[model samples]
Target: KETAAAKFERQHMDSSTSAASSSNYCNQMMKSRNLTKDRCKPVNTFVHESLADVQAVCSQKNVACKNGQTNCYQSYSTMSITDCRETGSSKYPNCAYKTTQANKHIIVACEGNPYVPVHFDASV
Candidate 1:
């Protein structure tokens, strides 16, 4: 079973070399991560910080999620993140994406202790 923490790690963690150096980063990542299974994920975001740094977001700002969930926390400091948006014309097997590099504070919802980000709400 894919734990919430693990799912969050695979889908969002990518601190190896900061943001993606290659433009095709999302295409490769999306496919490799199995997000492009039956259909491409319309959009996704990858954080360029370590898991610990990301999980730390839960300790700072106490903000409610979009759905009014109290477990959401906004990062006190902005983080380096890359957005992968699917190209409308992208086909299934040939899922395409446009990468947008950004430095912004992320808002995510956490479950409990150790504070794992289970849902990515939005970014500011």
Candidate 2:
């Protein structure tokens, strides 16, 4: 079974990609990263930062999750990120995405021992 921390890394971490050079970035990445399995993930954000910096977000400013959960935290500084939003015409096996790059404070939910990020709640 995949741990929550591991799942978060797979879905969100992308330190090598600073700015998406092409629009096809999401189309290629969503499939290659296994996010297109079963069904397309409607929306996702990939952070362009070191693993250490991302992990340190747990110790940043605390915030409420979208669902009102109190376990979420927001990064103090804006970080580079690529937001992938599925296109309306997207279909299974041909999932397409719109890639948008921005610098925003990420909000995530952390848990368990070592207290690392588990879920990417949003980018503010």
Candidate 3:
């Protein structure tokens, strides 16, 4: 089995140059490491817990929610979700996002109580 850190490096080596989307870094890491699906699909990684926690980390890193929608973060081809509504109408509306990149991944950190990454994988 591949280690998570190793996987992270493979997918996110280029993402380091990106000015936004640390979540994308996580996403690419997951996919390159094969934690999620293959190289084709919209990488969807879930982070359980309060959105506050996730946002805090993102804010500190200067990562904003993708497309200006609340509760979702993206960097190029990666998207990290803590609380998302795919229905297209909610406090956080669907951003209608997709990426053509061959490999992508996501990292999810749960909030409230013991904040931590709950899920790490590629979206589909």
Off by over 4 Å in 3: 1-15, 19-31, 35-41, 44-55, 58-114, 119-124
Identify the runs in model 1 with alpha carbons over 4 angstroms from their true place. Answer: none
What lDDT score goes with residue 35 in model 1? Answer: 86
Listed per model in order, the count of residue pairs whose N, CA or C atoms clash below 3 Å is 0, 0, 7
Off by over 4 Å in 2: none
lDDT of candidate 2 over 7-117, digit per residue (tens): 999999998877677888888878888999989888988999998899999999998899999889999999999999999998997889999989999999999889999
Worst 10 residues of 1 by lDDT: 111-120
User: Top model by TM-score, which number?
Assistant: 2
lDDT (C-alpha) at residue 25 in model 3: 43
**Which is the better candidate, 1 or 3, if ranked by lDDT?**
1
TM-score of 1: 0.94
lDDT tens per residue, model 3, 43-107? 33333323443333432322323344332332233332322112222111222222233323343
Summed over model 1, clashes come to: 0
lDDT at position 5, candidate 3: 35
